[PDB]
């Protein structure tokens, strides 16, 4: 799993 915060960081 990739965490929800890491996903948001990568998109931001």
């Amino acid at each position, epitope marked *: *799993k990739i965490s*929800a*915060s890491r996903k948001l960081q*990568l998109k931001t």
Partner: single-chain antibody
Amino acid sequence: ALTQPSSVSANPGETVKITCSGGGRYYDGSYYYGWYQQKSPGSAPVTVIYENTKRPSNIPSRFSGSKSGSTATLTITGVRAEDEAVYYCGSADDNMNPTIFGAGTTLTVLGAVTLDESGGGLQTPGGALSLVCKASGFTFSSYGMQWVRQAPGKGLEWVAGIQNDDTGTYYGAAVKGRATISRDNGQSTVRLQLNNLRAEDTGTYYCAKDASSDGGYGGDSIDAWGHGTEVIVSS
């Protein structure tokens, strides 16, 4: 946000199912949910299942979790009266909110990790408070940490989170621009500064440890909760 039923009832010994939907799709294309049990408003939530299926070792074997499509189900096989509680599901939304909670399902039955919050108290509207959580019993620098609050008689509400490496500080919509989360990995502490306080910020504020393997956090992955500290805002 997330959708779960307001209530479920069962007789002792039956199998109970509670289903939650509405979570955002994660980076790996899947969906992930956590289940958080609260037996009384005067007590901290307890994670019964996280990351869809993972059961903390101290949680009774009768709790299990599953996922189907974008939905998740908590199953209690052989329910007991002691299982009466509100069960909140948690996940992430599609974009800006890594942690979101359902409204809670109330179950009626017919017939070494420590997190220690401080800094609560009474404040007047417009003032500020600084909350602190001291952690022990785990490698603090490896894990994301979060703050979650609960107004009197209301459900769980995400306040803020921070990744293990100090980055990824994100905030709940109701506190945007008024909250700052920080952490000190050397002291095993996470801090929440709340400014421009409002009456409706009143509630119990819980520190929460995340279990995500990558040092991040989200609503599916809280594995430990503090005892809470009370914030009371009133003029």
